[PDB]
Amino acid sequence: EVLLLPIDHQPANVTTPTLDFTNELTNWRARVCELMKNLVDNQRYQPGWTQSLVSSMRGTLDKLKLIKSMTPMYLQQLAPVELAVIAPMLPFPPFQVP
Amino acid sequence: NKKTAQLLHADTPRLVTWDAGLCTSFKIVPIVPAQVPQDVLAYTFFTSSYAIQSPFPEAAVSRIVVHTRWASNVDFDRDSSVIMAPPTENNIHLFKQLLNTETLSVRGANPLMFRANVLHMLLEFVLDNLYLNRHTGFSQDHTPFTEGANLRSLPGPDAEKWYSIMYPTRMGTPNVSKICNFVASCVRNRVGRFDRAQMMNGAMSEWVDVFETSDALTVSIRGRWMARLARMNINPTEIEWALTECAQGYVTVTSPYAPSVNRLMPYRISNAERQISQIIRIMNIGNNATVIQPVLQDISVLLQRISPLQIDPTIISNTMSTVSESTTQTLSPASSILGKLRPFSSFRVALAGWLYNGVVTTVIDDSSYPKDGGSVTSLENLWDFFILALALPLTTDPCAPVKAFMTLANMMVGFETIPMDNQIYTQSRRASAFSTPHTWPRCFMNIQLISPIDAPILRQWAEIIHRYWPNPSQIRYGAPNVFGSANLFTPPEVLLLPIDHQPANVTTPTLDFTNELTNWRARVCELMKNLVDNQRYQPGWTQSLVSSMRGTLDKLKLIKSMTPMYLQQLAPVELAVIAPMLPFPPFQVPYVRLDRDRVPTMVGVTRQSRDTITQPALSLSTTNTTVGVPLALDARAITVALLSGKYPPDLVTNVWYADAIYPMYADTEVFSNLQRDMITCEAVQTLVTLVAQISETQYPVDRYLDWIPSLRASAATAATFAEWVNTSMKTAFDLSDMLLEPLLSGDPRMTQLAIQYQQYNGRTFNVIPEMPGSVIADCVQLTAEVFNHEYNLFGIARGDIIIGRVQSTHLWSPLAPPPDLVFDRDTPGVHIFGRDCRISFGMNGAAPMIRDETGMMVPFEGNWIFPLALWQMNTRYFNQQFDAWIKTGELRIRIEMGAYPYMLHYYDPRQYANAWNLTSAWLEEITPTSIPSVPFMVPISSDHDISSAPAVQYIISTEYNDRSLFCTNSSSPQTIAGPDKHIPVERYNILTNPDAPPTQIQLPEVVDLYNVVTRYAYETPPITAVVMGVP
Amino acid sequence: VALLSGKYPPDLVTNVWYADAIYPMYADTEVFSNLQRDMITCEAVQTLV
Amino acid sequence: VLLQRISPLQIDPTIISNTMSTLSPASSILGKLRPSNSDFS
Amino acid sequence: EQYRARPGIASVQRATESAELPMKNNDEGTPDKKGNTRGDLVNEHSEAK
């Protein structure tokens, strides 16, 4: 009766917040952003960069970090359901490996 | 560029609007005509037979209806009306105007969108009523109908009609008609003008209070609207003072001293309101240079026009034409320097930049540094160094010092060497790269690391940078008693400067070298001169070239430029005098000299929050979007400016400025902007307050429409909703640009405003603005609170319905059924149906059965309870299986709806009437996405014995919903058969109850249709009209 | 990009949406027939050996 | 494909476009993502 | 019939209509009634590519 997923799944609920750092995927988006930021902050890793791009490079990342995409929300709530609603009807049943 | 423009000049909202008509939003309409002529009451009885104009409709049936400004006569249309039709016509289209993009049927609407729609409706109900009640004029009554009262006159032709709808107490009472009875029982003395404020003999009354038709609700709305503006009012003197204070004395204006005629001039707003918009302002610009640049260029010009300083390059050329040198020489210090200077834009801009280092950091363009880095062996490069050294200090770039240093270090490679920090930021790395604190080389902060023996010049250069780099200062500007303060990280009135400002004590200037920047030129030259006379460098130049080089340097040192002086004595003032007039007020962050620990490393703003964080102060650090960009200037130019400044011959500051500034202070664009900010903030709060009704926010808030159904709202539906709230606002205030768009990014359910900046040492500074109130918001929530009672008046019925056959001759209103006919969940032997419900067909005669909610299976008969949704998700199957039993059988269903739009169908009681055809259609047209207005079949009330006849009904309500009914047979003496209703006294409390104060209202339980209204006539003149300047 | 820019329809109502998504899809189901085949595919293998 | 038209999720790049609002780091990332391209197989 | 499915019936059908389809038979490599294996004379690595 099992269908394996490489993601954590949660109960469906459209009221869910866009910036829910509880969602594994949303958090990753964040964490990866703040990393880059830390990287670019001191400009120790980019000589030959004539003007300070920290300000801009930062905001640019901040914008991506806080963008209101609902994709993660879906990939964790509905996506899983949909797949399950299909599996059984498929002509070539699933074949997974942990 | 759409943003760019909005910074320089945003559309100003249309605040002041007047209404000379009636202040009411409800109108009484006739549904079923009067029974005249008839077989019993002779026509000679009815008032209508004598052409007597009545205050109310003369008809068998009349109901109240919502219709904003139906009697209003205004100057500006806020194009946001809410118009309903008589309940006998379909109104569905008003409750499907929002999220029903997927709703197919035209007669239908989706219920889960009801609350959303209703909400927005109320929002417009308010917006469309935001006017000031204007005072017109009167005329004493020349008849005895009233005891010589003063009756107000409406403008426009075809006016005689109003005088009868206006004052009901004025009608005569000869009849025993339902109408006359009412009128007859009202207090006589409360009609016409009530009281006034006559100040000038032979001028208008400042305002007047007066009795006349109107509705307590919209009256209150307008009351608070005026209340809010009344707070923004300022008077001529206050303005005189304010302007005078800003100009620092150079300009003098005047206000009159004598009895005025009351003027409404709304402009004063709270600091809070200014900060909030200054953040929104900053928000939509951060990182995009091309938006802020044009702003600087503007100020750049403004300066050029007012500043007495003029750049005249010929100065450099003249002094240089006397430099001594040999012709047999290969190089010419004199020539080369001129060809390097190629003798403005960048200068004036650099200054402007001082006002916005919060978001813009000026820097010297890369193109101005030597390609390869330069070499102290190249006369050309020595001048390159010079140019840069003189310019750097005028940029807001907090790393300039280190660059000014490295700039030389780069040329000294191999000649003089120093201990750098690591292998990446080496002594040869382009100076222009040390753009952040983390890069300031150790030896630059601890001079001792530089050998006074192995690197004498380089060291000395450092000692200079340290001891002579300009010391920042400040100057006070503005006048907050009127303009409030847009400052965020600094104190009000404070304007920081990256230079030392020592006000001048005279008005008749003379060359002066006792300036901060003049020494800087001096030192820089002296250094060069030393680099040349250096015992191990001087042997490489012909003894002649040295003399020339020296001579030149001396002439540069002792050049007679005024710039350095101007920058210390006048420039700061000029800026301070302009600041108050800018559209986008200054946004600074402390200028620290070499105290790197305090260098700004980040500035960001938040407009949303995270997960479960509800306190701004906690989510700020992790929900801000960084702001700011660099702007590059041409070092060449800037230097030429600093080298060739010149004042007009016979200059006299006290006069010069008095002329130059006057015109600038005849541009009231400033004041206009305040009004915008005022709105920008009303808009924000209005959003959060409404949004919090369809979704769950972090703000405390009222809640009255929870009974009207609404879908589970996603961050998408949220935004879509917001978008409407936005539009409507702009539309009502005649705005064409942005408003709320900056905040609309993605999800609005957690909006919040705050800004912060951070130092190198990691210390951070937050700034959470105090949300001021909102009249718009309060007013919506007010009408919402009233909606919770007068809902029927808005075409909405509350409760559920019961589809079941009921045939009899009786005449009750299906909208006010008789108790024993309704049942509920707690009634005995009732079956509720849930999710697992299914149907098992009958067989061999047996009956079919549907499944209970507890798992009991019953036959198609009895009293069931269905939540609307359940039917919707099975319309076809159900209509097919049940309809037959509902019609001729013994099945009665109660559909749970909560709230629903309704439509009435009146019929003649003496003739058979079966409502099936009507309800059949309803049921059949129900969809998992829509439902049409519930149809009710109600009898026509009569005023005389009438035979009787059967009537088969199928739909009745669960609770009273006939509050829309105003009166029956209004012109007859009494209603004998059918629903009887006499003119609702409760609505005319001021007239029906003598012991009540004139100023008493009954909201939010009852909307009185006759109150005391205050009408103003204040003047709204242009500032230039009362505050005059003295040229 | 997909991860960065997704959104639902503002008037979404799962209960309805998926109902409309399953009906037509299950109505064309072939589960049953595949089951019968699976039965033979086996018998075949078994027979062979 | 089945999954695409059975799913209520919609992909709308403009979201990115509207958030950036524009060497420029901002433009670079945009040119790198290429929002105009509507293939998401 | 005041209802319009969402997602649309047609849309979903065509879609599942193609998912329904069973994967293709792979003769290549097996023998025919005569005993000769069918397919082309190509290297296993090349065929894969």
Curated annotation (Swiss-Prot), chain C:
Superkingdom assignment: Viruses
Disulfide-bonded cysteines: none
Locations listed in the record: Virion
Subunit: Homodecamer; each decamer is made up of two conformers of VP2, called VP2A and VP2B. 12 homodecamers assemble to form an icosahedral capsid. Interacts with protein mu-NS; in viral inclusions.
Family: Belongs to the orthoreovirus lambda-1 protein family.
Function per UniProt: Inner capsid protein that self-assembles to form an icosahedral capsid with a T=2 symmetry, which consists of 120 copies of VP2, with channels at each of its five-fold vertices. This capsid constitutes the innermost concentric layer of the viral mature particle. Displays NTPase, RNA 5'-triphosphatase (RTPase) and RNA helicase activities. Helicase activity might be involved in unwinding or reannealing dsRNA during RNA synthesis. RTPase enzymatic activity represents the first step in RNA capping, which yields a 5'-diphosphorylated plus-strand RNA.
Record's protein name: Inner capsid protein lambda-1
Source species: Reovirus type 3 (strain Dearing) (T3D)
Full-protein positions shown: 884 to 932 of 1275
